[PDB]
């Protein structure tokens, strides 16, 4: 989206992320990812590989 | 025989070791961490996950 994003005024920044990677032979347990709306699905877990 | 440059943000595991060497009394057992070794090397035997 912008790779150089200046903080708005309507925005606080919480913080930054770095970028979580799964190697070819890893997985890793999301819990509380968001559906397809967008809404954190809490309780729930994912599982993600590949 | 490559040499390229240390691109920003890529890093060496453990750098330059060695290549692996082996004779008629030497082996490498090998624990095949990721499934899938089917064009590996030019065995073409398709080695599971840590067979």
Same mark, same amino acid.
């Given at each position: @989206? &912008?790779?150089? $994003? ?8 919480? /913080?930054?992320?770095?970028?979580? &990677?799964? *190697?070819?032979? $890893?997985?890793?347990?999301?819990? @509380?990812?968001? *559906?397809? @709306?967008? =809404?954190?699905?809490? *309780?729930? =877990?994912?599982?993600? =590989? /590949? | ?8 943000? #890529?890093?060496? #595991? ?13 082996? +490498? +057992?090998?624990?095949? +961490?990721?499934? +899938?070794?089917?064009?590996?090397? #030019? #065995? ?8």
């Amino acid at each position: @989206d &912008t790779e150089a $994003h200046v903080p708005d005024v309507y925005e606080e920044v919480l /913080g930054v992320v770095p970028i979580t &990677t799964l *190697g070819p032979r $890893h997985y890793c347990v999301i819990l @509380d990812p968001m *559906g397809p @709306d967008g =809404k954190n699905q809490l *309780g729930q =877990k994912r599982v993600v =590989k /590949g | 025989e490559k040499s390229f440059f240390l691109q920003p943000g #890529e890093r060496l #595991e453990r750098g330059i070791q060695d290549v692996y060497v082996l004779s008629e009394q030497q082996g +490498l +057992l090998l624990k095949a +961490l990721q499934p +899938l070794e089917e064009g590996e090397s #030019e #065995e073409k035997v398709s080695h599971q996950a840590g067979d």
